[PDB]
């Protein structure tokens, strides 16, 4: 019909997939062991969510999910957790040794020992999609398997299924926060390999989401369970049009056709709103304008570059729940009219708008805001060229001294691989500079009069 398939790649992808797949059950009434607790048509009906689940037995749900890190410790938490009896036991996949925060262990040794077991179970899910759209991968660019397996999966999928939607969903490098000494290398060996494959790739940073939780939600203590249980609502707001009815719904293809002027410029940065504390939600007005204002606010962005350092190319601004097309048109006309909120000179048409009737729904187990309506935004902009410039800075100090490179060598990797990934970053730097320019015409050299 309209089927999607998610792959949860490495520790971050997995930790995220546990948040996501609480909410994908919870939206439909589906219980933590796949059960539909009450069904108006046992063996058909609505059930609009066969796009996210395959049905078995007497109306038990099996999800359309995959879990993989070469660490049992993070997958066994799926097979012994609160939801163990939801998922499929040959869809909680491991390997014999975890990837040490390294690329080459993925791409040329140990990921390369598990890729054909994974691609096979993916083939059995795919054949059971009557209307396969494509697949999403959830990762960190800074991850070990995150870098090393996504790359090797999308080298396989993009010529296994081809014209099918190729998506990524990525934890994207923090400006000042870090986790690992080896993140710049993991990121840049994956962009080299995988930016040739995704049609659109959707971006968030932990340093911004920590900010959202400390400011907007007014949480003193963001655990990763506090963080990821926000992100759930991002893909819940992206995926609504495939899960519920409405007025102006958006397939997984249309983000591509609209967010991407050029097929290297397909990394749009997310934000989602409203986000308030359980004190703030009782004094706010939370109308569509006021959401849409907070959606373009620089502090409020889910990748931590200020969009004002950039210029906007394109954007996608989907609305969910209590929302009205004239009221939305009014907020678009407002952000548009404030030209100070800056687009490129050449932009004829920069927007993609949507209406889905089902509201936002939270989780059990917080002091949380049960709002009536929400927006989910993705920004395409030269502001990502500020954080490319940071990867250009991080890389060159390490790689000149040739720090760490022997750990990648000894697990299957060329030296020319690093070099040719940074070469691609030398291109990307400029691929993003040949856009931020104004459309004015002319060439060569002159020093005299025409008049």
């Amino acid at each position: 019909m309209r089927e999607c398939i998610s792959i949860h790649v490495g520790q971050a992808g997995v930790q995220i997939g546990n948040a996501c797949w609480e909410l994908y059950c919870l939206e439909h009434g589906i219980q933590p062991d796949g059960q539909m607790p009450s069904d108006k048509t046992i063996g058909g009906g609505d059930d609009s969510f066969n796009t996210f689940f395959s049905e078995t037995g007497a109306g038990k749900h099996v999800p359309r999910a995959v879990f993989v890190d070469l660490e049992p410790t993070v997958i066994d938490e799926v097979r012994t957790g609160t939801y163990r009896q939801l998922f499929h036991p040959e869809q909680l996949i491991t390997g014999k040794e975890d990837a040490a925060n390294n690329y080459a262990r993925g791409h040329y040794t140990i990921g390369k020992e598990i890729i054909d077991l994974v691609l096979d179970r993916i083939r059995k899910l795919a054949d059971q999609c009557t209307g396969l759209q494509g697949f999403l991968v959830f990762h960190s660019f800074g991850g070990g398997t995150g870098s090393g397996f996504t790359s090797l999966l999308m080298e396989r999928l993009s010529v296994d299924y081809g014209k099918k939607s190729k998506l990524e969903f990525s934890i994207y490098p923090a400006p000042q926060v870090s986790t690992a000494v080896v993140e710049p290398y993991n990121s840049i060996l994956t962009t080299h390999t995988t930016l040739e494959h995704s049609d659109c790739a959707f971006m968030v940073d932990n340093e911004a989401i920590y900010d959202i939780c400390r400011r907007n939600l007014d949480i003193e203590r963001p655990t990763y369970t506090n963080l990821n249980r926000l992100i759930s609502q991002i893909v819940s707001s992206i995926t609504a049009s495939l899960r519920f009815d409405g007025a102006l719904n958006v397939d997984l293809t249309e983000f591509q056709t609209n967010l991407v002027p050029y097929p290297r410029i397909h990394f749009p940065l997310a934000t989602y709103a409203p986000v308030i504390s359980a004190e703030k939600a009782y004094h706010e007005q939370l109308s569509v304008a006021e959401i849409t204002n907070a959606c373009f606010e620089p502090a409020n962005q889910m990748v931590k570059c200020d969009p004002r350092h950039g210029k906007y190319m394109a954007c996608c601004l989907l609305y969910r729940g209590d929302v009205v097309p004239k009221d939305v048109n009014a907020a678009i006309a407002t952000i548009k009219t404030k030209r100070s909120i800056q687009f490129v000179d050449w932009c004829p048409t920069g927007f993609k708008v949507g209406i889905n009737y089902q509201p936002p729904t939270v989780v059990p187990g917080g002091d949380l805001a049960k709002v009536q309506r929400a927006v989910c935004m993705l920004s395409n902009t030269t502001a990502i060229a500020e954080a490319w410039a940071r990867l250009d800075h991080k890389f060159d100090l390490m790689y000149a001294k040739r720090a760490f490179v022997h750990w990648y060598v000894g697990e299957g990797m060329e030296e020319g691989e690093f070099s040719e990934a940074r070469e691609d970053m030398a291109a990307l730097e400029k691929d993003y500079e040949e856009v931020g320019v104004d459309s004015v015409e002319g060439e060569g050299e002159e020093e005299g009069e025409e008049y």
Partner: protein, 445 residues
Amino acid sequence: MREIVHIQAGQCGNQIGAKFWEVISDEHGIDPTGSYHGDSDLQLERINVYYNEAAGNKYVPRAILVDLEPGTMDSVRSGPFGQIFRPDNFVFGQSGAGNNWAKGHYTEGAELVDSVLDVVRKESESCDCLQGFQLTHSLGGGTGSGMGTLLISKIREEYPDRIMNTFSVVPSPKVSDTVVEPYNATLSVHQLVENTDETYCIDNEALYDICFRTLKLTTPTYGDLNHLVSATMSGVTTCLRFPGQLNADLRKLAVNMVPFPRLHFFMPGFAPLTSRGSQQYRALTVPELTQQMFDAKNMMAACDPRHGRYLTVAAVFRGRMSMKEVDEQMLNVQNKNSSYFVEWIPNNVKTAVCDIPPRGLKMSATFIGNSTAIQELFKRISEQFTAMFRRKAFLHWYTGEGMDEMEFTEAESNMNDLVSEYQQYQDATADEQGEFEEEGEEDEA
């Protein structure tokens, strides 16, 4: 005798279509069983124009549903009058058009459009005299744009002398809902311009403003916005189904609205339009109907007709009307507004009057005005299109389905040519045009 097929295409065009068919089912007294239990002979005795007749006292609407994405199509099925629609008139893909006109023209529409043409045929061998084709769709859509212009350009080769008529959502001037609007719109207009007979331009920026200004609706919904559209398609087809003093059927209409075969894009309007406050105080009369019909904020395009000149106008009045009171109001406008008519088409009005008003209005009028003013639409879209193809922006997605750069050039070449034809006739003289040279005086030898 004379019967019309309608097609609905796009998630946009089927959501309009599904509610047009409610409004019409209301006008004819059809119950959501597909059964007539209305309230006048005529409603049943001219049901033929729109529905197939079926045994056991049933009518099936002669409308087809098309979208390459299954989503909204099922929303129409389990909604209002969804069960009167024929299951075998739903024709649906799996993948979508992706907002992409060339994925609709070349991939997922070529893969599906014959199976439709077959249903369109099965409908056409149900029509004793096939009138022609109505469409509702979106130009900013994928499927409505791309797979509809596939269908438009294929019908015309198969149905040569029948009319093929269109009610398009068109891009608006202030905002945009989809980024590839200028590509989709301009690739569309390329096909439409030479395979259709009418192009009713419908614009959400006006629809949203009519709902806010004239009906004092604080929060206009798409429910609201399709209603006006439905009551205007209603209007435009009233003279086949319902009698009166002057009947102006879809043939007769078109003859009086298209002066040359490419100048067939119109600004429709509905009258009256009045808030729940206003309805108490305004008198519902032929002169307040005429004034609201010319009222430059009340047209269904977000473009100001007073920027140009009417080539031609038509009106469809509905209810108990008085012929001198219609004609003299049509005359009073043309007298006080001489600057708003083109001077070499004389007396720029097509009148027509039906006996029978729309259900829940004591009297109404429909406007179909053909102005130069539509230059504005093609002026904005062809600069936005050169803004895109000059920089090959968004274009890899469509070439990536088997289109070539020659075609973008030919869609553009034609729209620029087309805006130059409407601007050739924007304010074109009734005074002679060109060749101003002469013979001299006789000379000594």
